[PDB]
Every structure is written in C-alpha cells, then in structure tokens.
Amino acid sequence: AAENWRDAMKTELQTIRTEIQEETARRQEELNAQNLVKMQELMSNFF
C-alpha cells in the first residue's frame, strides 16, 4: 500500500513537471522574440 501511494504521488509529480517544462519552453521562446524587438528598437532609437 505504501509502494502504491508512492507510485500515485510519482505519476502526478510527472504531470506537474511536464506542464511546468512545457510552459517554461513557451515563455522563454516568447522572451527571445521580445529581446529581438527590444534590440531592433534600441538600435534604431539611437540612429
């Protein structure tokens, strides 16, 4: 029963980890896109 409880905690910890990893990947891709806009902004903002 203790082992079954451990397994139940494990499968949910995996779902939470995958959801966090997928959200992180999406947010960091968006950050790269924003950094490029912010650099193209800052460059033309000088000249």
Numbering used by the authors: 129 to 175
Copy out sentences from the published article reporting this entry, exactly as the authors wrote them.
C. elegans SAS-6 physically interacts with SAS-5, a protein that shuttles rapidly between the cytoplasm and centrioles throughout the cell cycle. The presence of SAS-6 and SAS-5 at centrioles is essential for formation of the central tube, a cylindrical structure at the core of the emerging centriole. Overall, these findings led us to conclude that the segment between residues 125–265 contains two independently folded domains and encompasses all structured elements of SAS-5.
Native crystals of SAS-5CC diffracted to 1.8 Å resolution, whilst phases for structure solution were determined by single anomalous dispersion (SAD) using trimethyl lead acetate derivatized crystals. The structure of SAS-5CC suggested a parallel trimeric coiled coil, although this arrangement is distorted by crystal packing that intercalates the ends of successive triple helical bundles. To correct for these distortions, we performed molecular dynamics (MD) simulations starting from the crystallographic structure of SAS-5CC, which rapidly converged to a trimeric coiled-coil structure. SEC-MALS analysis of a slightly longer coiled-coil construct (SAS-5CC-L, residues 101–206) demonstrated formation of a trimer in solution in a concentration-dependent manner, with apparent Kd of ∼3 μM. Both the crystallographic model and MD simulations show a series of hydrophobic residues (W133, M137, L141, I144, I148, L159, M167 and M171) forming the core of the coiled coil and enabling trimer formation. Interestingly, we found that all these residues are conserved or conservatively substituted in SAS-5 homologs in other Caenorhabditis species, suggesting functional relevance. Taken together, these data support the notion that the SAS-5 coiled coil promotes the association of protein dimers towards higher-order assemblies. We found that the thermal unfolding profile of a SAS-52–265 L141E mutant showed a reduction in stability of the coiled coil by approximately 25°C, whereas stability of the Implico domain was not affected. Substituting an additional core hydrophobic residue of the coiled coil (SAS-52–265 L141E/M167E) effectively abrogated coiled coil formation, again with no effect on the Implico domain. As anticipated, coiled coil disruptions in either SAS-52–265 L141E or L141E/M167E mutants yielded a stable dimer in SEC-MALS experiments, mediated by the Implico domain.
